[PDB]
């Protein structure tokens, strides 16, 4: 019932989004095996070493932690914009 | 050299007993606007109402 | 002795609006049925038909 609006409509908003000014970097390449992000270290001869993507537990901001339980409200109970016959 | 073209099962299963391939309907579908489960289903609600 | 054009409708008297068919314009035309999704105000007629 959902792929009707989901693949057809969510997909586009996503693609348009793949081109947002800031969302830079690289996120994937469709391959689960092999693709490993590119690392960046701000290195300095004077003995500086602060890498960009470092792993450091859950921050206060509140993003670090991913929570898969979110799949259900999206999958089971969440009305759509182009699903039940809005513009 | 790819032509990523969808194959209408209808156009690879001429077994009339279970796949209305009537040339006549061969075209009603072309006339229709990409469906969905919701609409295929909605027509049923309406065709039936 | 005057008639001008003689079309061949679709006998409006049989396909009464008890079949939700608004047949004037020339072609059938049920209202809410195989409607397309995600389109402006109009667009709901190329296939209303």
- C-alpha distances in angstroms, A1 versus A36, A44, B8, B40, B49? 34, 55, 21, 11, 21
Given a contact cutoff of 8 angstroms between Cβ atoms, the answer to whether C48 and C29 are in contact is yes
Q: Give B39: exposed, middle or buried? Use CB within 10 Å, 0-12, 13-18, 19+.
A: buried
CB pairs under 8 A between A and C: 15
| Farthest-apart Cα atoms in chain A, separation | 65
Inspect the interface and report whether the beta carbons of A85 and B37 lie closer than 8 Å.
no
Q: What's the token pair of residue A52?
A: 């960009």
Q: What's the token pair of residue A45?
A: 């001869």
Inspect the interface and report whether the beta carbons of B31 and C34 lie closer than 8 Å.
no
Q: What's the token pair of residue C40?
A: 């402006």
DSSP-assigned letters across all residues of B1-49? --------GGGG---GGGS---HHHHHHHHHS----HHHHHHHHHHHH-
Contacts with A77 (C-beta within 8 Å, 6 or more apart), sequence order: none
Interatomic CA distance for residues C8 and A29, integer angstroms: 60
List of chain B residues whose C-beta atoms are within 8 Å of the C-beta of residue A85: 38-39, 42
Residue in B33, B46, B47 closest to C36 by CB: B33
Q: In sequence order, which ranges of chain C are alpha helices (DSSP H)? A: none
Indicate the resolution in Å: 3.1
Interatomic CA distance for residues A10 and A3, integer angstroms: 9
Please state whether beta strands A48-51 and A41-44 pair in parallel, antiparallel, or not at all (unpaired): antiparallel
Interatomic CA distance for residues C28 and C14, integer angstroms: 12
Write down how long chain B is.
Answer: 49
Neighboring chains of A (3 or more beta-carbon pairs < 8 A): B, C
Neighboring chains of C (3 or more beta-carbon pairs < 8 A): A, B
Interatomic CA distance for residues B26 and B28, integer angstroms: 6
Contacts with A62 (C-beta within 8 Å, 6 or more apart), sequence order: none
List of chain A residues whose C-beta atoms are within 8 Å of the C-beta of residue B39: 85
Beta bridge partners of C30: C21
Solving technique: cryo-EM
Inspect the interface and report whether the beta carbons of B37 and A1 lie closer than 8 Å.
yes
Residue in C32, C35, C40 closest to A87 by CB: C40
Interatomic CA distance for residues C37 and C43, integer angstroms: 10
DSSP-assigned letters across all residues of A14-82? HHHHHT-SS--S----S-SSS--PPP-EEEETTTEEEESS---S--SSS-S---GGGHHHHHSS---SS
Is the CB of C41 inside 8 Å of chain A's CB atoms? yes
| Farthest-apart Cα atoms in chain B, separation | 49
Write down how long chain C is.
Answer: 49
Interatomic CA distance for residues C42 and A62, integer angstroms: 44
In terms of Cα–Cα distance, which of A4, A78, A87, C32 is closest to B38? A4
Residue in B31, B39, B47 closest to C35 by CB: B39
Residue numbers preceding breaks in chain C (C to N > 2.5 A) = none
């Amino acid at each position: 019932n959902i792929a009707v609006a989901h693949t057809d409509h969510l997909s586009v908003v996503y693609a348009t989004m793949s081109n947002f000014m800031l969302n830079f970097t690289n996120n994937f390449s469709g391959n689960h095996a092999t693709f490993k992000p590119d690392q960046y270290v701000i290195t300095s001869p004077e003995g500086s070493y602060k890498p960009i993507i470092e792993r450091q537990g859950e921050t206060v901001d509140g993003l670090t932690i991913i929570d898969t339980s979110i799949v259900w409200p999206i999958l089971c109970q969440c009305t759509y914009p182009l699903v039940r016959q809005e513009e | 050299r790819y032509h990523e073209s969808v194959l209408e099962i209808a156009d690879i299963f001429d077994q009339a007993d279970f796949i209305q391939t009537s040339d006549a309907v061969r075209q009603l579908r072309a006339l229709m606007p990409t469906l969905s489960t919701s609409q295929i289903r909605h027509a049923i609600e309406r065709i039936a109402q | 002795y005057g008639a001008a054009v003689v079309n061949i409708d679709l006998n409006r008297d049989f396909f009464d609006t008890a079949t939700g068919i608004d047949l004037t314009k020339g072609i059938p035309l049920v209202q809410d049925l195989l409607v397309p999704i995600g389109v402006t105000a109009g667009a709901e007629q190329s296939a209303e038909y």
